[PDB]
Amino acid sequence: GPLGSKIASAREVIKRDGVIPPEALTIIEQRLRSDPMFRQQIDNVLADAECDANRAAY
Amino acid sequence: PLGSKIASAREVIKRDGVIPPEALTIIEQRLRSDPMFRQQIDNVLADAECDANRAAYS
């Protein structure tokens, strides 16, 4: 339906431009609250970044 | 510094399940650099699209 079509187009922005538009962000945030595995996944992505950054000089 | 900014954003995600702008930056860089994470994000959206297109009356 029309809402599914809008989600499909948001998927294309991610696929073609590597940008997460607002509607996609909110879906991803809902997923953080409804999927313990994905919640862990996202924490892992950020943890990878943090651990490297914490021990950096600059 | 980048480390403690990331750490604070991880806590926001854990507590509230919303993604601060500074964490979104990191997430976008990850999906631009990591084919599997890019597809994992698409899978989240694909499920939302599929659900939005559920059988329904009009």
Numbering used by the authors:
A (entry chain B): -3 to 0, 210 to 263
B (entry chain A): -2 to 0, 210 to 264
From the paper:
C. elegans SAS-6 physically interacts with SAS-5, a protein that shuttles rapidly between the cytoplasm and centrioles throughout the cell cycle. The presence of SAS-6 and SAS-5 at centrioles is essential for formation of the central tube, a cylindrical structure at the core of the emerging centriole.
Each chain features three α-helices (A1 to A3 and B1 to B3) that interact in a pairwise manner (A1–B3, A2–B2 and A3–B1). We found that this newly recognized domain is highly conserved amongst Caenorhabditis species. These dimers cannot be disrupted even when diluting the protein to concentrations as low as 20 nM. We envision that SAS-5 would readily dimerize even at low concentrations via the Implico domain, as oligomerization of this domain is tighter compared to that of the SAS-5 coiled coil. SEC-MALS analysis of the same construct shows a concentration-dependent trimerization, again consistent with formation of just the SAS-5 coiled coil.
